[PDB]
Every structure is written in structure tokens, then in C-alpha cells.
Ligand binder design. Structure first.
Ligand code: FMN
Ligand code: CA
Ligand code: CL
Ligand code: CL
Length: 487
């Protein structure tokens, strides 16, 4: 019998037979920022600067870490108003993620709870008390909390995405959040911090600790921030993910009620007690993807510029990528060990990349036949599984978007959901989508650094993808990332 994550997935697919048979409540379009009536505001803008104090140097690092992670980087006009685009992309420009900072209490940062205000690049200190032990208990005394003095917690304000995507919003929320997680690790590197990803925590406890309404908002990632300038905080990566239960006895949940049901049925509760790529394709054509690394400038200066200017490309011109360009994108995304000499982490935390497979539809990469390839990141190989021009198909698969038709290459992240659930329970659904978004952000940043076009695609004809591209039946497509040359 299917578990609730499989049911959720099935219920949120798009089907060409029914997509036409499926009105936004504008009176209700959410404002994607939180308001606080009580608390001290800490303005971070004075520290987002140039040159020419050790306390100021500390605030500059926190200010920059937050700004490069989730700061406002552009504005658009929209129905008589302005949408502010951010460092992290978001399905529909809806921004379900909220960033909090939790302080253990240091001589510079009072203890308690802080909300990151994108609009003003400030922190609102809305609760001053020592909350660290409560956070430790909620995360099963994770060792990363013992060494550190502050943590980011990322939550999702469900309605921000559900307003548009209804129950399908849970996929988009987790993807959006994964993109933000990718910025956090890169932004941290820039500022000599390392985040320690904690996906395994007692939801009830974390949500209580933040004083948020769990029907409207819920924590999905806890990230202690280790200060790499403190020898004592250069700690080993730890357990990034824990299992939830597997629920097979779910009731019939009406449309519109499934997203919250699913979030509340993927929680973790207090305890009662206490190296080969997956698909060998041995008789298929294999092509090495070994690449020289992307150069990010002195002291990651070009990574900073790229993070600031990064936008999702509206349209492609249909021109080709070079194979070197494709290899460089894959290298930065999947081979972080090749960036240690540029001060990036050789192994940034994910929940579990072993659960995610990568397939690439290639339509316009010079030196590569058009078709579908399995990407084997451990071996650093593309293995050709189909030989065909897939432009027309990809156009359809991406819900009719020209981005799919005109892309040079389209990267599909997939997962065998049954197997994933067997390991981490239904909560693995969160982990998969956050990991795919994290990979996605690395791909987006690499593309922009290389003067290429890129855009995620959240909605697609789920079942039809495998059929067209030759992706093994057991692999459910989780996310799509298009790559091309900008129009
Ligand atoms: C999970 C996710 C799904 C997305 N789906 C699409 C999509 O199908 N089509 C599209 O044109 N852009 C898509 N995007 C891009 C968003 O529209 C974009 O991130 C948002 O408008 C903000 O713009 P920015 O990325 O330039 O900051 C997606 C982005 C995310 C992160
Ligand atoms: Ca777009
Ligand atoms: Cl207080
Ligand atoms: Cl084979």
C-alpha cells in the first residue's frame, strides 16, 4: 500500500488529460514578508559595504551572509505595485521561505529570536530569552549546536505558495527552500561560516520555540552557523537527516486539505526510548564530463557579483552551449571538492544526495549528440540512453513553456520515492525537494557566471517524462532545470 508521500505525489502531478479541466483570489494575494509590532530592529545595511573594528567585522559577515542568501536584488512592476525579486528564486515569485536567526547569546548578539526582514535588510529581535537549550532538545542534542553560537532556521509560510499552487505548493515550497539552502552554504563560504544542515528535528518543538502558528508556518531546516575563524567551530559534518514514520493508513483527504495534512503527517516526535552510481548502463555510450573548475575571482568576488545579479531567464534564443560549458556547470554543481582551493566547501551538507538521480536531455550542446543521458557524478560520465531531438517533447513536458523547447539542455532530478521512503519515511519528500533545489541553485549560479541562461521549471507532466526520455519507471521526476543562451 502506498504511503502518504506517494499519495501526495500522485495527487499533485499534472496530467495532460486533465490539465485543461483545472481562479486566483487576488483579494487574498499574500504579502511575502512578516510584520512585527514588538521588538528591536537591528539595521544590517551599515555593514553591507566597502572599507575601512572587530565587532564591525563580525556584523559585516552576518549582514553579508544574510543579504547574499535572501536579500532583495531586483524589482518588477506588477498590477499597480512592485514585486521584489530576491537572491533566491521562487516558484511564482511567491517566497514561501522565512529566515530566522537564533542566538545563543554572545557579547555582540543578544540571545533569543530574530526574524530577517528582506525589505529593510534588518533583523527584528522579537524575543529575548535563552532559547538555545530548547533548540538543542528539539534537535536531539545535535553536536553542531554544542559548538556554535547562532543558527538560521528556515520556515515555510504555506499560503504564500498555496495561494497559487494549492496542494501542489508543497513541492514548490521545498524546492524554493532548497534554493535558499544553496545560497546559505555559498554565502557562508564567502563569510568564513559553515552551516550544518539539520533536517531531523521535533517540528512541534521548533515551531513552538519560534512562536509561529503551525497551521500557517513550519520549520523545515535548522542550520547552526559555524564560525570557521574559530578553530573550535571547524567541526565534522553530522547527521543531516532523520527518518519520520511511514504512514499507509491515511484517510481520504479532500483537495485543498492535503498540503497541511501532509506537513503535519511528516513530523518527527520525541523518542520513546533513544560508492557507485546507481545506474551502470554498461552497454551504453559513455562520455567523460571531467572538467576544469569555474574560476570565481579573487576571494570569491565573481561568486558575489553572480549571486547578486542572478535572475531566472525569461526566454532562450535557441543557441547551443559548448560541451565545456555543460561540463563546467556539472562540475560546480556536483563536484564541490574541485573548489576547495577557492575557499568553497568540498562537501557541503545535503539531506541525502544518494536518493537523487540526474538525467539530462540534450538538444543543443556542441560536440554532444542530441538525446537523453544519465549523469553519473561519481564516475563523471554521461551515459546515452536515448538518441533523439527532444525539443518538441520538452516543450510539451514543461507545460508548454518555450523554455523547454529552446533550452540547450534540460536537467531532470529524480528519485525512487518508495526506496527513499523506506529509508527516511514520508518526511523524505521534504528532503528530496530541498536537495534538488540546492543542486538547482548551484546550477543557476554557475550558468549566470558563465553568461548563460537558466530557469527552474516546477510544473511538468510527471508521468509522461519517463516515457519520452527513457528515464527508468521507478524514478519520479522531482525537478527540472533548463539551460540555454538568453534571448
Ligand atoms: C521551484 C521553482 C520553479 C520554477 N518554475 C518556473 C517555471 O515553470 N517557469 C518559469 O518561467 N520560471 C520558473 N521559475 C522561476 C521563477 O519564476 C523565478 O525564480 C521568480 O519569478 C523570481 O525571479 P528570479 O529567479 O529572477 O529572482 C521557478 C523557480 C523555482 C525556484
Ligand atoms: Ca520565467
Ligand atoms: Cl522578549
Ligand atoms: Cl545498458
Amino acid at each position: 500500500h502506498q504511503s502518504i508521500a506517494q499519495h501526495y505525489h500522485e495527487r499533485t502531478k499534472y496530467d495532460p488529460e486533465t490539465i485543461a479541466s483545472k481562479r486566483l483570489d487576488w483579494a487574498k494575494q499574500p504579502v511575502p514578508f512578516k510584520e512585527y509590532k514588538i521588538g528591536s530592529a537591528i539595521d544590517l545595511k551599515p555593514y553591507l559595504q566597502e572599507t575601512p573594528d572587530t565587532n564591525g567585522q563580525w556584523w559585516q559577515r552576518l549582514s553579508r551572509l544574510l543579504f547574499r542568501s535572501y536579500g532583495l536584488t531586483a524589482r518588477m512592476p506588477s498590477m499597480g505595485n512592485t514585486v521584489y525579486l530576491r537572491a533566491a528564486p521562487s516558484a511564482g515569485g511567491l517566497y514561501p521561505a522565512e529566515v530566522y536567526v537564533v542566538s545563543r547569546g554572545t557579547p555582540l548578539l543578544s540571545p533569543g529570536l530574530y526574524n530577517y526582514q528582506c525589505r529593510t535588510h534588518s533583523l527584528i529581535h522579537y524575543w529575548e530569552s535563552d532559547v538555545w537549550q530548547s533548540l538543542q532538545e528539539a534537535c536531539f542534542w545535535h553536536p553542531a549546536l554544542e559548538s556554535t553560537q547562532l543558527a538560521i532556521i528556515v520556515t515555510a509560510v504555506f499560503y504564500r505558495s498555496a495561494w497559487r499552487y494549492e496542494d501542489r505548493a508543497y513541492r514548490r515550497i521545498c524546492l524554493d527552500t532548497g534554493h535558499l539552502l544553496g545560497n546559505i552554504e555559498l554565502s557562508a563560504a564567502i563569510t568564513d561560516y559553515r552551516p550544518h544542515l539539520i533536517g531531523g528535528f521535533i517540528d512541534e518543538a521548533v515551531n513552538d520555540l519560534l512562536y509561529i502558528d503551525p497551521l500557517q508556518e513550519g520549520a523545515i531546516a535548522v542550520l547552526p552557523l559555524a564560525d570557521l575563524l574559530d578553530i573550535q567551530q571547524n567541526i565534522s559534518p553530522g547527521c543531516t537527516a532523520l527518518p519520520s514514520a511511514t504512514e499507509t493508513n491515511y484517510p481520504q483527504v479532500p483537495d485543498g486539505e492535503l498540503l497541511k495534512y501532509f506537513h503535519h503527517h511528516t513530523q518527527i516526535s520525541a523518542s520513546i526510548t533513544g560508492l557507485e552510481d546507481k545506474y551502470n548502463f554498461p552497454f551504453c555510450l559513455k562520455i567523460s564530463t571531467v572538467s576544469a573548475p569555474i574560476y570565481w575571482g579573487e576571494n570569491l568576488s565573481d561568486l558575489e557579483i553572480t549571486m547578486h545579479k542572478r535572475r531566472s531567464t525569461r526566454a532562450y534564443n535557441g543557441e547551443e552551449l559548448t560541451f565545456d560549458e555543460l561540463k563546467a556547470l556539472l562540475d560546480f554543481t556536483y563536484q564541490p571538492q574541485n573548489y576547495i582551493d577557492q575557499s568553497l566547501d568540498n562537501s557541503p551538507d545535503y539531506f541525502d544526495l544518494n536518493l537523487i538521480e540526474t538525467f539530462i536531455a540534450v538538444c543543443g550542446v556542441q560536440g554532444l549528440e542530441a538525446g537523453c543521458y544519465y549523469y553519473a557524478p561519481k564516475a563523471q560520465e554521461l551515459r546515452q540512453i536515448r538518441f533523439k531531438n527532444f525539443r518538441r517533447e520538452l516543450h510539451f513536458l514543461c507545460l508548454g513553456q518555450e523554455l523547454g523547447r529552446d533550452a540547450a539542455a534540460v536537467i531532470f532530478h529524480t528519485s525512487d520515492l518508495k526506496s527513499a521512503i523506506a529509508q527516511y519515511g514520508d518526511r523524505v519528500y521534504r528532503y528530496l525537494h530541498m536537495d534538488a533545489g540546492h543542486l538547482g541553485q548551484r546550477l543557476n549560479l554557475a550558468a549566470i557566471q558563465l553568461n548563460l541562461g537558466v530557469s527552474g521549471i516546477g510544473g511538468f507532466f510527471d508521468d509522461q517524462v519517463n516515457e519520452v526520455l527513457g528515464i527508468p519507471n521507478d524514478e519520479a521526476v522531482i525537478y527540472i532545470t533548463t539551460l540555454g543562451r538568453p534571448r
